[PDB]
C-alpha cells in the first residue's frame, strides 16, 4: 500500500528594527496612541457567548498605574464548571481533525501576528505589560509567531513518527489528544507564553480552559481573538480569567482534568500537583503537569573574559524589562582582577540607563515593574540590601510608586555569596554581585552550582577555551539553558528550546520538537491481514 | 558548518522455534535440568558489593511451590539509602559518558541474551515465573533483546536532534540524564519490563535502584548479572530487591529521588504518585513517574468475523501465561448471530487445553498462575462467577494449589454487559463473554467504550472495512494498543510501542521512540563567537 504524506518546514519569525523612519515604529506609534485614554471591556468566553460575572477587574498600565487599560471579570466556580463542559463536548471532533488541519489555525494566527496585528499585540503588550518596544517585539510578537508556526512543524512532522511494519499486519501510531481538558496557567511577564500554554495542546488535540494573568489581560485577550478569527473553533479554547486558587480549585476537582500547562511561582506549581495528587482517586486518567519555574541565574566572569561582552550582556539580562524573567541574570560572580574595570564600567553604563514610560519615550531601556504586590515585595529587598552587613549597594537602590511601579536598576555587592539575596529570586531590576579570588576560580564554579536550589539559565564568560569546558561540565545541572559568552535570557524558539531542572520546572523545553509529546497520548494501532491459525504451538505438537 | 549525525539499522530478533531437533530445544531441555532440584542464592548488590540482610526470602515454582528456586533478602532502609548514596556518587561520570559508549552496554547484553545466555534465561523465566517454553522466549529473550537494541538505536538517534544554529551562535542540545537517582520498579510478569524499566534510565545517563519483583527474582538477577558482565560499571543499577512498601517509603524520601518507574498496579502507583506530592518540597528536582498499570482488555466480535481467528486469537490473548497480561482479553463481545458457532467452537478448543509443568511438559499452553495471592483472588472470582445470577460458567471454573497454584481456563457468560466480572482485572486464565444483538452492535460498541475504567488493549474482529473504521474511531481512547483482526496481546518492541491510558497508566509508550524523552532533562547550550555590542538598541538613539 502506500499514503501521501506531509512536510512542513518553517523560519523564525526576523525580529525589526523600528528605527526612525521605519513602518513599524510608525504602526507601533499608531497603535499605541489608538489604546492611549482607552479601556477595553474584556469578557470571559465560553464557546462564542462573552460572559460577564459581577466580579469585576481591571488591568492598569505598569508605568502609569492611574490609567486603567482594561476591565474584565473572573470566571466563578459555575461558569468554569460550563466551560469544562462545553470544551468537553467540543474535545471528540477535535481530536479527529487532522494535524495539518489544526495546524493550520496557528499559521494563520501566526501570519496576522506577523503582519496587519503587530502594532496592536506589540502596543497591548507595551501598555498592559510595561514592555518596551523591543521587549514587546521579541515576545508579542517573534516568540509567539514562532512558537505557532515551529509547534505546528513539530507536530506535522511527528504524524511522520510511525513505528515498524511487518506483513501480515500494518502498525500505525495516531497521535491522540489527552482525553479530558487542559488547564492553562499563563504569566504577566511573556504574552508569548500565554499563547503557547494554551495553544500547543489545543494544537495536539486538546481543549483547553485558559486563565490568563490577570496583569497581561489586554494582551492575551488579543491573542484569544486572533485564534479564533484565524479559524479556532468555539470551545477548542474557553478564555477565563478568574481569581488563582479558585480556578486552581476548580480545575483540579474536574474528574475531567488530564493535564495543567502552568508557568509561575514554583509554590503554586507545588500546590496544582499536591491539589491533583489529594485527588488522583476522581480522575479518569493521570493528569500532566508541566510547570516552568523561576531562577536565580547566573552570570559567571573569568579572569579571561571580554570586559565589555559582560558588562552589556548582564546590563541586558539583569535589567530588560525591569529584571522580569525567569531567566534573568541576578547574580554576577566576577574574579578579583577583573572587577575594578568591571565595576567602573558597570557603574558608569549604570548612569546612562533610563527609566520611564515605554509608550511616550522610546528611548527608555525599562519601564515600571508589573504591579503593586511586585513593586513592594522589591522594596523589601532593597532596604535588606541597606540594613544587612554583608551587602552593599553599588547603583541605584530608589523605586517610586507615586506614578508607576518605578524600580531604579539596582546593583549589590555581596561579601556573603551564600547571603539570602544570592539565592532567592527577586524578578526585578537587582543584580547581586560577588567577587571571588583568581585563585579560587574551580570552588568558586562549584558555588554557583551550590548555591541556590534553581537550574534554569546561566552564563559563562571566558576567553580561555579550557575554562569553557571545565565550567560546562561543571555547571551541566545548574542551567537548563546554558549561555557561552552571551546573556542567560533571551531564548530563541527552535534555536534555544527553553527550561531547566532542580526547582525551575519540569523542563518540558518549549520551544523545541519534544515539548509538544506531553499534550499527546499516542495510540497505536496493528491491522492484521490474513486469518489467525491454530491457538496451539508447533513445539506443542 | 557540518553536522553528523549517527543512526543505528537494527531488526527484531527472531522469536525462534524450540521444535523436536532445533539447538534451541535441546539447549533449554539442558538449561532446565541443570536448574531442577537447585536453589541460586542471590545477594542485594550494591556497586560490586554483593549483601545479606536477615530478612531472607524465598522464590517457589509457580507450578511446584514446593521448590524453592531462589533465596534472596530484603534491602533495609539503611542498605537502601547505601545504594541511594553509592549510586548518586557514580552518577557524574556515567551520565557524562557518551551515549554510544553506554549504548554498547546494552547491545551486548543484546547479543548475550541472543545466544550464549538465552537458554538460561529462558529457563529461569520458565521455572521462576511459569512461563512455557514460548512465553518465556517472546519475552526473556525477544522483548528484552529488542528493548535493548531499539532504545540504544533511539538514545543513539536522539543525540542528532539538535537545534537550529544563526551565527555568530552555535546551539547545541545536551541530552541529560535526569540529577538524582530513578527508582525501578518491575512486576512478575515479564522479565523483559524488569530490564527495560532499570535499563532505559541507565542507558540515558541515570542511576537507578531496581527492586524487582519477588516472584521473578531468579530471571531479573540473571538479567543483573548480565547488564553488569556486558560492561556495566558499578552503581549505575543497584540490585535491591525489598519490601514493596519499605522501598516506596524509603525512594520517596530521599529528597535525591529524581524519578520512579513503575509497573504494576494502580493503587500501588497511585500510592507512589501521592508520596512524591506528599514530599514535594524535599526533592531537589521534581520527581518524574512513570507508570504502566493494568487492563480490562476486549475481542469485540462483528457479525461478519472471522469465526476461527476470533476462537484462536481470543483463546491465546486470554489463556496464554495464564491470562497474567496487562493486555489479556478478559471480555468478549459477541453477536448473538455468531455466537452458537463461536461458543461451540470455542467450548470445543478448551477441551484441548492442556494446564501443566511447562519445563517437564512442552505440550502445556500454560501453567500455573503466580503465587497464593493471586491464587486465592482467583478463586474468589471463580467462586463469584458461581455464586452471581447474571453469571454462567460454559467452561473450567476448578482450581488446585496442592502441588502448583493451577487454575483452569475459565469462560464466563454474563447477561449483565456491566457485571463487576466485565470490569475488574482478575489477572487470571478467565474470559468473559457479553452476548449482544446484531441489531444494538452501535450501542455495544459504546459499551465496550464505557463500561471499564481502563484503556489498555483492546481488538475487533470483523471483515466488514466499514465496521472497523467505525470502530476504531470510537474505541479512540478505550485502547493505547489497538489491533483489528489479531489477539490484544503480544506488542512487538518498533512495532507496536505498548501503553495506554485512562487508568491504565501515563501512556509513555515503551518499545517506541519517545520513550526515552522521560528519563533525559535536555541542557541547551548556545555559544556565540562575536563580541556582544551595545546594551542599547539603535530604536533607542
Redesign the interface.
Known amino acids: 500500500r502506500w499514503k501521501h504524506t506531509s512536510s512542513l518546514k518553517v523560519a523564525?519569525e526576523p525580529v525589526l528594527?523600528?528605527?526612525?523612519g521605519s513602518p513599524e515604529?510608525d504602526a507601533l506609534q499608531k497603535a499605541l496612541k489608538d489604546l492611549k485614554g482607552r479601556m477595553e471591556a474584556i469578557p470571559c468566553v465560553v464557546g462564542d457567548e462573552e460572559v460577564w460575572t459581577s466580579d469585576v477587574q481591571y488591568q492598569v498600565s505598569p508605568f502609569n498605574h492611574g490609567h486603567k487599560v482594561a476591565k474584565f471579570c473572573y470566571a466563578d466556580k459555575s461558569l468554569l464548571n460550563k466551560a469544562i463542559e462545553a470544551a468537553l463536548a467540543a474535545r471528540?471532533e477535535w481530536?479527529?481533525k487532522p494535524i495539518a488541519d489544526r495546524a493550520q489555525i496557528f499559521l494563520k494566527a501566526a501570519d496576522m501576528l506577523s503582519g496587519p496585528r503587530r502594532a496592536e499585540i506589540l502596543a497591548k503588550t507595551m501598555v498592559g505589560q510595561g514592555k518596551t518596544?523591543?521587549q514587546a517585539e521579541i515576545d508579542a510578537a517573534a516568540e509567539l509567531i514562532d512558537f505557532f508556526r515551529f509547534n505546528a512543524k513539530y507536530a506535522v512532522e511527528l504524524e511522520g513518527?510511525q513505528?515498524?511494519?511487518?506483513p501480515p499486519?500494518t502498525?500505525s501510531?495516531?497521535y491522540?489528544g489527552?482525553?479530558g481538558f487542559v488547564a492553562a496557567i499563563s504569566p504577566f511577564n511573556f504574552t508569548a507564553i500565554g499563547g503557547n500554554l494554551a495553544g500547543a495542546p489545543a494544537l495536539m488535540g486538546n481543549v483547553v480552559l485558559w486563565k490568563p494573568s490577570d496583569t497581561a489581560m489586554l494582551a492575551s485577550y488579543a491573542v484569544y481573538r486572533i485564534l479564533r478569527e484565524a479559524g479556532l473553533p468555539p470551545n477548542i479554547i474557553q478564555f477565563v480569567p478568574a481569581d488563582g486558587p479558585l480556578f486552581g480549585d476548580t480545575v483540579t476537582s474536574s474528574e475531567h482534568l488530564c493535564g495543567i500547562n502552568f508557568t509561575g511561582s514554583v509554590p503554586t506549581f507545588?500546590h496544582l500537583?499536591?491539589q491533583?495528587?489529594?485527588n488522583?482517586?476522581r480522575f479518569?486518567?493521570?493528569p500532566?503537569l508541566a510547570?516552568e519555574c523561576g531562577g536565580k541565574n547566573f552570570h559567571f566572569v573569568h579572569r579571561s573574559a571580554?570586559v565589555?561582552?559582560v558588562?552589556?550582556?548582564t546590563?541586558?539580562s539583569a535589567f530588560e524589562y525591569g529584571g522580569q524573567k525567569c531567566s534573568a541574570c541576578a547574580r554576577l560572580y566576577v574574579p578579583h582582577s577583573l572587577w575594578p574595570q568591571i565595576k567602573g564600567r558597570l557603574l558608569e553604563?549604570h548612569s546612562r540607563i533610563k527609566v520611564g514610560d515605554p509608550a511616550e519615550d522610546?528611548?527608555?531601556?525599562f519601564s515600571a515593574v508589573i504591579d503593586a504586590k511586585s513593586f513592594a515585595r522589591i522594596k523589601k529587598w532593597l532596604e535588606h540590601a541597606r540594613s544587612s552587613p554583608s551587602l552593599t549597594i553599588l547603583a541605584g537602590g530608589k523605586c517610586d510608586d507615586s506614578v508607576g511601579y518605578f524600580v531604579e536598576p539596582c546593583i549589590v555587592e555581596s561579601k556573603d555569596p551564600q547571603e539570602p539575596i544570592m539565592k532567592e529570586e527577586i524578578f526585578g531590576p537587582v543584580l547581586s554581585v560577588y567577587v571571588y579570588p583568581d585563585d579560587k576560580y574551580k570552588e568558586t564554579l562549584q558555588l554557583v552550582d551550590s548555591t541556590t536550589?534553581y537550574?534554569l539559565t546561566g552564563a559563562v564568560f571566558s576567553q580561555d577555551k579550557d575554562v569553557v569546558q571545565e565550567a560546562?561540565?561543571v555547571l551541566?545541572?545548574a542551567?537548563?539553558?546554558?549561555?557561552?559568552?552571551?546573556?542567560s535570557t533571551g531564548?530563541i524558539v527552535?534555536?534555544?528550546?527553553?527550561g531547566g531542572?532542580?526547582?525551575s520546572?519540569?523542563?518540558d523545553?518549549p520551544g523545541?520538537?519534544?515539548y509538544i509529546?506531553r499534550w499527546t497520548?499516542?495510540?497505536?494501532?496493528?491491522?492484521?491481514?490474513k486469518?489467525?491459525?491454530?491457538?496451539?504451538?508447533?513445539?506443542?505438537?
Chains 1, 2 share one sequence.
Open positions: 523564525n528594527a523600528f528605527t526612525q515604529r471528540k481530536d479527529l518596544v523591543i513518527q513505528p515498524i511494519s511487518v499486519s502498525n501510531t495516531v491522540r489527552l482525553e507545588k500537583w499536591k491533583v495528587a489529594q488522583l482517586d479518569h486518567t493521570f500532566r510547570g571580554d565589555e561582552s558588562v552589556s550582556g546590563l541586558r553604563e522610546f528611548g527608555t531601556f536550589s537550574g560546562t561540565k551541566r545541572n542551567a537548563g539553558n546554558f549561555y557561552i559568552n552571551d546573556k531564548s527552535g534555536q534555544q528550546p527553553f531542572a532542580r526547582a520546572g519540569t523542563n523545553k523545541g520538537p519534544h509529546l497520548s499516542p495510540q497505536v494501532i496493528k491491522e492484521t491481514h486469518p489467525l491459525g491454530d491457538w496451539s504451538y508447533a513445539y506443542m505438537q
